[PDB]
Design a protein around this ligand. Structure first.
Ligand SMILES: Nc1nc2c(ncn2[C@@H]2O[C@H](COP(=O)(O)OP(=O)(O)O)[C@@H](O)[C@H]2O)c(=O)[nH]1
Ligand code: ALF
Ligand SMILES: [K+]
Ligand SMILES: [Mg+2]
Lengths: 409, 51, 102, 52, 51
């Protein structure tokens, strides 16, 4: 009579077993104890059956050391790093290739004519890039890119699919921007496969603006500079410096952003875009002879100074851009009357050369990160354990459940 | 309480907002660091497939 | 002389300050009329001299902006939307005396 | 370090982990886990009502 | 070879325990002690003798 609730709940719980224990015992304890074990051993079989089919598409099984998903290993490491720590304290040590140049330059063109001309919003009239956009490029068949790491099933050769895909990126671009600016550091993750793509991660950072017009929020240019720290403070970053080709070098902002990152050019390659606008105005071949020799740019960027050219129409297909680029570079006096041989200028040489420099930096510096993170853990565990000797291992899921049981108790 | 706790079990944001004791967050960081070390070495191990 | 704000090609580092002094000798004149020559082969977001007249002539009493290479608006080389806005004046962080096409 | 519980706890934890990866648990990885697939198939057989 | 794959791997636990014990004795008593094998001690004694 002192208490009756406990008796009632226990009695009905005892009744539930008498009728259904022959099903509850299997489901509640036997299945759950084996459930974790089968995850390691039997799900292994189903994962391998599909993985092998996927590897055949990769060709990794067929060919030793050659696999399109091999480059996807690089992105996976960075994806965890960005989720673990997106701040400069970690991002500044992560190798990457960035597209850096005047906003006017159309700097992203270096990537558009590879895979992004089909799915990335472009065209003149407004600033397009709103936040860093990273594209994981990999040798493979045509395949709809991942959008914010989300799976998609689209045909990259048809306009109806591509237009929807262009919308998806635009939504992320604008949503990353908050009131008070027009640019945001919040990144957009893209992973695309297709012919002509190199194994590398190229990031289209928002274009720098010398002055913040009344059509942009006041903090636009300061924000871009802070976002530009992705390479200015990153010894592991490779910078593609884009000069707006139509105007001259002394006027451009990119000169100062990179020269304060690496004045020797060791971490950067200079690239020029819209060179063909030299022949829509009075062309200066002598000014182009200073461009290739880097007399005109203070960062002294290393490598061949590739040039990107295009019709200027925002609907030109990737194949059309490549054909236009080859014909123009092989005949234009801008390069034929100066020491810029077309086969070095062509964007496809830059993609190969950028891929070549990409793996040079990644292998050299990646091993330093392993020691750095391990040292970080030991220093964190030593202090964390000393201040919290009770908890040698803790998780927020373990913390909640203890309270859940404690509260109910 | 059981109904509420189950809602909290699913309510990750409140669990994060409620569980801000600076040791679980450090423990969470340690887990992430451990995961990165595996992810860093996994890629580094994949670089070493050349030899 | 046109403003550079950065010195390249072995040029003496004092060149940008000399240029600004030469141009401020007039842009700081209360009665002067300032004609800002804007390269039209670039988006409006790239404007080197806007920030100077926005301080020496924030009231739009002297400064007139003129767009060069207007043929690039026809070709879409330069963003037409920003060109229309600069014609209307929505992109200036200042008052301006006027705007004309080159 | 002398007469400090923290050092004893660290030593105990290191030794405990070494024992956890020792031969006592290593054998079970090659004698018990590989039949969890058969256990799962038997669970599926048990949940089916055909036998009942 | 089955016994090899089953049992040889766990010999690392005792190897690590032995290294830990030796390095622990060093840290507690011989923080300056290194791989002071037949060559290093001989060289140090020789140099001290000559000096
Ligand atoms: N003339 C010329 N136009 C280009 C080149 N690259 C891109 N464009 C044009 O610039 C517009 C968008 O290019 P994009 O790379 O997105 O530049 P952004 O939008 O300013 O960042 C499109 O209409 C393209 O036709 C080039 O090398 N030469
Ligand atoms: F014109 Al941009 F990023 F180069 F918006
Ligand atoms: K633009
Ligand atoms: Mg763009």
């Amino acid at each position: 009579a002192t208490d009756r609730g406990s008796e009632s709940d226990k009695h009905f719980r005892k009744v539930s077993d008498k009728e259904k224990i022959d099903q509850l015992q299997e489901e509640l304890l036997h299945t759950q104890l084996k459930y974790q074990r089968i995850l390691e051993r039997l799900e292994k079989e189903n994962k391998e059956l599909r993985k092998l089919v996927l590897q055949k598409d990769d060709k990794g099984i067929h060919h030793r050391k050659l696999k399109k998903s091999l480059i996807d290993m690089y992105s996976e490491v960075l994806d965890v790093l960005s989720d673990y720590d997106a701040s400069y304290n970690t991002q500044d040590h992560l190798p990457r290739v960035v597209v850096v140049g005047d906003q006017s330059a159309g700097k992203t063109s270096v990537l558009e004519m590879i895979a992004q001309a089909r799915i990335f919003p472009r065209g003149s009239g407004e600033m397009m890039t709103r936040s860093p956009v990273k594209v994981t490029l990999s040798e493979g068949p045509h395949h709809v890119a991942l959008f914010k790491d989300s799976s998609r099933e689209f045909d990259l050769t048809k306009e109806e699919d591509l237009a929807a895909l262009r919308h998806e990126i635009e939504l992320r671009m604008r949503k990353n921007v908050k009131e008070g600016c027009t640019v945001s550091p919040e990144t957009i993750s893209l992973n695309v496969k297709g012919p002509g793509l190199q194994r590398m991660v190229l990031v289209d950072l928002p274009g720098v603006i010398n002055t913040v017009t009344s059509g942009m929020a006041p903090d636009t240019k300061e924000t871009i500079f802070s976002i530009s720290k992705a390479y200015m403070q990153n010894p592991n970053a490779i910078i593609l410096c884009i000069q707006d080709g139509s105007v001259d070098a002394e006027r451009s902002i990119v000169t100062d952003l990179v020269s304060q990152m690496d004045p020797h050019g060791r971490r950067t390659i200079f690239v020029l875009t819209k060179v063909d606008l030299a022949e829509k105005n009075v062309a200066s071949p002598s000014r182009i002879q200073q461009i290739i020799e880097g007399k005109l740019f203070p960062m002294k960027a290393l490598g061949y100074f590739a040039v990107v050219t295009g019709k200027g129409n925002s609907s030109e297909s990737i194949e059309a851009i490549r054909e236009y680029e080859e014909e123009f570079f092989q005949n234009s006096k801008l390069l034929k009357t100066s020491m810029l041989k077309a086969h070095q200028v062509t964007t496809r040489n830059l993609s190969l050369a950028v891929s070549d420099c990409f793996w040079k930096m990644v292998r050299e510096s990646v091993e330093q990160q392993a020691d750095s993170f391990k040292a970080t853990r030991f220093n964190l565990e030593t202090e964390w354990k000393n201040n919290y000797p009770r908890l040698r291992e803790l998780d927020r899921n373990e913390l909640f459940e203890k309270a859940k049981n404690e509260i109910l108790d | 309480v059981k109904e509420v706790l189950e809602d909290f079990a699913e309510d990750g944001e409140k669990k994060i907002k409620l569980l801000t004791g600076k040791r679980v967050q450090l423990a969470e960081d340690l887990k992430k660091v451990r995961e990165i070390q595996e992810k860093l070495d996994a890629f580094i191990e994949a670089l070493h497939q050349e030899k």
